[PDB]
Structure formats: structure tokens, C-alpha cells
Ligand binder design. Structure first.
Ligand SMILES: COc1ccc(S(=O)(=O)N(CC(N)=O)c2ccc(N(CC(N)=O)S(=O)(=O)c3ccc(N)cc3)c3ccccc23)cc1
Length: 280
């Protein structure tokens, strides 16, 4: 069946774990290690293939690597134009967008697009704001970049990229400042879960309604967490790991929108933060 993959991460040191969770029966699979251990990367899926993008070996990474579930093997891909630690990614029409992130002290506002069929990256219009630790979501064939840190200020702003027009517009700001939050899309809304507001790791969660242009708080998580992994599986949000301000979590919580409830449904084989997560 479809699995929740978690790639890389950090606990005491950069990790190369690739593990996958089966919500059906609660089991965990151990898969082929990443070639280079990394945290602060992003994960995504195009055409049934899993991609690990950017991050840092703790050296910032411009790397893109593709994992094939059917062969259990990692294959290097064309690198990005620049290293991107604390990157966000989204997928539109089988193309991977690499958003923001950092190279040393350089906070990127640039964005580039990867085409698997041709193993090529191309720059598109840059964001209106530099964003590292940015959350990314794809909705109605638009790309949203949410929160982050612009090099001096932590951000509650969000903005939206129009692929056909190749341009960005700011949207309504979130209620809370969030860097390192989990951003995903569930039933036509953008969810921003956790992250760091400049003082604390957060357990609060807000969702954006694109038509009313409003961010509304929903039920908070049980654990405060920043740099959590996030994905959507069968109509539910799953968050994985993260840093709560003291410990590297192994908690995996699951949000059910029908009940507006969070519940802890499993734990990773070891606590970690800064993972890349995707489902296939
Ligand atoms: C003061 O405590 C904090 C305050 C704010 C944040 S943050 O979440 O907001 N943030 C910075 C930002 N501007 O977004 C981030 C920091 C570090 C990362 N990692 C390493 C990396 N690749 O850089 S890590 O996950 O592996 C890791 C986390 C915590 C510890 N202790 C060690 C390692 C992040 C990875 C992804 C997204 C955001 C990351 C975090 C801790």
C-alpha cells in the first residue's frame, strides 16, 4: 500500500535513515540509507519516485537524490543551482519546486523547478521574501510559501506563486510567526502546524481558507515541535518528529479533520527532527 516515508533528519548528528510507516497495520520498514546523511532537507514524490532535496550534512546541500521503492535504491540527480538548507518543496504537474532555504548565511528568495523527464533544474520568478525554514503547499495548481526566517525577522507572512504567470503575490499573514513549521494541504485548506515563533516551539495549528483569505486556529498538537515532518494520508495529517525545545521527538501524531482531534498513532524508531517526508 501507500507508505509514509521519512528521510534523513538529525539527532546528535545528521542521519541517513530512510524508513517508511504503514498506517494500515502500524509497521515500520527500514529501507536503503541515503548516500549522504542530511537534515533540513525536503521530500516529495513524482510518478511513484521519492526525492530528497537540499538540506545540510553536519556543509549545505544542493543535492537532489531519487529513491525508487521498486528497487530500494537511491540515484543521484542533477543538483540545484545553489545549496538549500531548510528548504521547502512542492510538486506541480510532475515538476519539483525548490523554494528558499539557505547557503551559509545567504537566505534565498530564489526558486527553481526540476523536470524529472530531462533531469534539469531551471530558475523561475523569485519570492517577494527571503525564506528559510519555509513551509510549502500546492493547492489549485498554485504554490504557497508559508513563514520562515528572512535573515533578520521571523515571518508570519505567506505568498503564492502563479506558475502560468510566473509571479508571486503576498496573501494574508498567519496569526502566529512560524519558522520550521509543517505545511500541507488537506481538503482544500492550507495547514501550518507547529514551528518556532522566536521564543518557543509551537503546538498550535492554523489553516488558511483561500476563498475567505482567513487563517483560523484548529486543535493544537500534543507536542510542541519545530522542524517537524508532515504529510497527508487518507484524509488525515501526519506529523513526524521535530524538536520541542529540549528533546528530539519520535512522536508521530495524526490529525483527523472530521473530529478536529490529534492523536499519537506511532513513534519513529528513534527521535529526530529536520526530516523530509512524503507518501507513495
Ligand atoms: C533555538 O532552537 C530552535 C529554534 C528554531 C528552530 S527552526 O525550526 O525554526 N529552524 C531555523 C529556521 N530559521 O527555520 C531550524 C533549525 C535547525 C534545523 N536543523 C538543522 C539544519 N539542517 O539546519 S535540525 O532539524 O536538524 C535541528 C533542530 C534543532 C536542533 N537543536 C538541532 C538540529 C531546521 C531544520 C528544518 C527546518 C528548520 C530548522 C529550531 C531550533
Amino acid at each position: 500500500g501507500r507508505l509514509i516515508y521519512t528521510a534523513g533528519g538529525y539527532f546528535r548528528q545528521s542521519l541517513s535513515y530512510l524508513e517508511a510507516y504503514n498506517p494500515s497495520d502500524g509497521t515500520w520498514l527500514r529501507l536503503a540509507d541515503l548516500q549522504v546523511p542530511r537534515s533540513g532537507l525536503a521530500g516529495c514524490v513524482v510518478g511513484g519516485l521519492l526525492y530528497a532535496v537540499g538540506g545540510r550534512n553536519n556543509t549545505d546541500s544542493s543535492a537532489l537524490d531519487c529513491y525508487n521503492p521498486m528497487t530500494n535504491q537511491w540515484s543521484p540527480c542533477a543538483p540545484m543551482s545553489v545549496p538549500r538548507n531548510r528548504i521547502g518543496v512542492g510538486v506541480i504537474d510532475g515538476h519539483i519546486y525548490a523554494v528558499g532555504g539557505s547557503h551559509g548565511c545567504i537566505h534565498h528568495n530564489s526558486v527553481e523547478r526540476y523536470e524529472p523527464e530531462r533531469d534539469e533544474w531551471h530558475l523561475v520568478a523569485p519570492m517577494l521574501t527571503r525564506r528559510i525554514g519555509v513551509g510549502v503547499a500546492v493547492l489549485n495548481r498554485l504554490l504557497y510559501a508559508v513563514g520562515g526566517f528572512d535573515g533578520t525577522n521571523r515571518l508570519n507572512s505567506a505568498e503564492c506563486y502563479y506558475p502560468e504567470r510566473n509571479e508571486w503575490r503576498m496573501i494574508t499573514a498567519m496569526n502566529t510567526i512560524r519558522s520550521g513549521a509543517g505545511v500541507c494541504v488537506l481538503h482544500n485548506c492550507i495547514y501550518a502546524a507547529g514551528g518556532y515563533d522566536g521564543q518557543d516551539q509551537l503546538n498550535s495549528v492554523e489553516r488558511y481558507d483561500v476563498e475567505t483569505e482567513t487563517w483560523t486556529f484548529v486543535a493544537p498538537m500534543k507536542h510542541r515541535r519545530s522542524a517537524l515532518g508532515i504529510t497527508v494520508h487518507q484524509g488525515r495529517i501526519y506529523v513526524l518528529g521535530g524538536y520541542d525545545g529540549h528533546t528530539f521527538l519520535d512522536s508521530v501524531e495524526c490529525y483527523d479533520p472530521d473530529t478536529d482531534t490529534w492523536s499519537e498513532v506511532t513513534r519513529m524508531t528513534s527521535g529526530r527532527s529536520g526530516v523530509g517526508v512524503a507518501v507513495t
